[PDB]
Enzyme design. Structure first.
Site, PDB file in Angstrom:
ATOM      1  N   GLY A   9      34.787 -13.640  26.960  1.00 24.41           N
ATOM      2  CA  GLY A   9      33.394 -13.926  26.654  1.00 24.41           C
ATOM      3  C   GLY A   9      32.786 -13.101  25.538  1.00 24.41           C
ATOM      4  N   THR A  23      30.240 -12.267  32.087  1.00 27.15           N
ATOM      5  CA  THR A  23      29.166 -13.229  31.773  1.00 27.15           C
ATOM      6  C   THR A  23      28.717 -14.184  32.893  1.00 27.15           C
ATOM      7  OG1 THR A  23      30.891 -14.602  30.749  1.00 27.15           O
ATOM      8  CG2 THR A  23      29.504 -13.259  29.281  1.00 27.15           C
ATOM      9  N   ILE A  38      34.864 -14.847  44.385  1.00 26.10           N
ATOM     10  CA  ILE A  38      35.730 -13.673  44.512  1.00 26.10           C
ATOM     11  C   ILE A  38      35.373 -12.561  43.535  1.00 26.10           C
ATOM     12  CG2 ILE A  38      37.739 -14.779  45.534  1.00 26.10           C
ATOM     13  CD1 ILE A  38      38.942 -14.668  42.552  1.00 26.10           C
ATOM     14  N   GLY A  39      34.335 -12.767  42.730  1.00 30.83           N
ATOM     15  CA  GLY A  39      33.905 -11.712  41.831  1.00 30.83           C
ATOM     16  C   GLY A  39      32.921 -12.107  40.762  1.00 30.83           C
ATOM     17  N   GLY A  59      32.426 -10.805  36.441  1.00 28.54           N
ATOM     18  CA  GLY A  59      32.717  -9.893  35.347  1.00 28.54           C
ATOM     19  C   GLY A  59      31.691  -9.941  34.236  1.00 28.54           C
ATOM     20  N   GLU A  67      43.464 -20.622  35.298  1.00 33.80           N
ATOM     21  CA  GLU A  67      44.564 -20.132  36.106  1.00 33.80           C
ATOM     22  C   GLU A  67      44.059 -19.121  37.141  1.00 33.80           C
ATOM     23  OE1 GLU A  67      47.351 -17.963  33.692  1.00 33.80           O
ATOM     24  OE2 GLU A  67      48.878 -17.874  35.254  1.00 33.80           O
ATOM     25  N   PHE A  68      44.550 -19.253  38.369  1.00 32.98           N
ATOM     26  CA  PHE A  68      44.164 -18.320  39.411  1.00 32.98           C
ATOM     27  C   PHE A  68      45.145 -17.161  39.526  1.00 32.98           C
ATOM     28  CE2 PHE A  68      43.990 -17.226  44.071  1.00 32.98           C
ATOM     29  CZ  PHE A  68      42.970 -16.296  43.903  1.00 32.98           C
ATOM     30  N   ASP A 124      36.520  -6.449  24.998  1.00 27.96           N
ATOM     31  CA  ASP A 124      36.185  -5.902  26.306  1.00 27.96           C
ATOM     32  C   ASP A 124      37.447  -5.562  27.121  1.00 27.96           C
ATOM     33  OD1 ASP A 124      34.170  -4.885  28.046  1.00 27.96           O
ATOM     34  OD2 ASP A 124      33.883  -6.828  29.050  1.00 27.96           O
ATOM     35  N   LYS A 136      35.306 -19.970  36.485  1.00 31.76           N
ATOM     36  CA  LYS A 136      34.311 -19.069  35.951  1.00 31.76           C
ATOM     37  C   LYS A 136      33.043 -19.882  35.758  1.00 31.76           C
ATOM     38  CE  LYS A 136      33.883 -15.319  32.614  1.00 31.76           C
ATOM     39  NZ  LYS A 136      34.546 -14.498  31.563  1.00 31.76           N
TER      40      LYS A 136
END
Length: 292
Positions: A162, A34, A29-30, A32, A98-99, A142, A52
């Site tokens: 990260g 790292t 779904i994406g 970011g 967690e989603f 970040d 992740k």
């Protein structure tokens, strides 16, 4: 130098095994900071979780992968995405977390207009997370709309740790050039030592994101935008005419060049602007599945 050596290090730090033994149907779904992020289905329940995935070989600074583990272990909070478990799968680190099914603030900011009730709600939640994290030497580093996540019922959580680092009595300041160009604090681009104030600066840029739809100098090449952030007076809103004076006064406490003069998250929690903050329900209509 050296890959296999670094896999061994993470192995000692992570939970044994491979979460594929309880998760089905990985769907990306994406992506970011790292690595990439997937949804997975817990096989036993039909519950959804996020994973992740971060390829060891694809990291600029492999050591920063440990920051993930450091935040899992020490820093749980309501407005911080909870991480559950981490594993070493092949050459990847997987963090089952967690989603946040409401997705990222970036989708909101680019596609609709936020009123000030909603801007304040987001600001309040982020500042709640920050002041607790900051009180414990942790700097996120970040902060931006991509690092802010939402539940379906409009709750707001910091994700994407990260790039984070710790400070303390022994190391009060950091020196690394970390973040996303357009959101970076001037002292951080200046390579001067810095602390948690950089997070407050990045919040300012995010408030701009929330009002203008983009951060300043977004049109410019990354390096040019950084220079301009470093060398000029604080960047202005494109839509200054559209903000209440309450908001302007708030934003002026964030986008202060002198980090010593910049407001702290604790000070900001008391600023009048947050009085306008609404329930997490107020954010709900903004999301892709609800707006038309």
């Amino acid at each position: 130098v050296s890959h296999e050596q670094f896999r061994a290090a993470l192995q000692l730090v992570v939970d044994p095994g491979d979460p594929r033994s309880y998760l089905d149907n990985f769907i990306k779904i994406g992506e970011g900071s790292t690595g990439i992020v997937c949804i997975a289905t817990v096989r036993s329940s039909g519950k959804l979780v996020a994973v992740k995935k971060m390829d060891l070989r694809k990291q600029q600074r492999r050591e920063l992968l440990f920051n993930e583990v450091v935040i899992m272990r020490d820093y749980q909070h309501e407005n911080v995405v909870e991480m559950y478990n981490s594993y070493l799968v092949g050459d990847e680190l997987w963090v089952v977390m967690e989603f946040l099914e409401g997705g990222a603030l970036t989708d909101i900011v680019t596609h609709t207009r936020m009123n000030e009730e909603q801007i304040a709600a987001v600001c309040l939640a982020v500042l709640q997370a920050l002041s607790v994290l900051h009180a414990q030497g942790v700097i996120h580093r970040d902060i931006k709309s991509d690092s802010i996540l939402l539940t379906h019922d409009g709750r707001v959580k910091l994700s994407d740790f990260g790039f984070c680092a710790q400070v303390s009595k022994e190391v009060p300041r950091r020196k690394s050039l970390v973040g996303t160009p357009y959101w970076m604090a001037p002292e951080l681009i200046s390579r001067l030592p810095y602390g948690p104030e950089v997070d407050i600066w990045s919040l300012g840029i995010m408030v701009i994101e929330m009002v203008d739809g983009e951060p300043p100098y977004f049109n410019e090449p990354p390096l040019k935008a950084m220079k301009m952030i470093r060398d000029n007076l604080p960047p202005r809103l494109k839509n200054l005419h559209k903000v209440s004076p309450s908001l302007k006064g708030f934003l002026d406490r964030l986008l202060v060049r002198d980090p010593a003069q910049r407001a702290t998250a604790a000070e900001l929690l008391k600023h009048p602007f947050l009085a306008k903050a609404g329930p997490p329900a107020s954010i709900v209509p903004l999301m892709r599945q609800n707006r038309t």
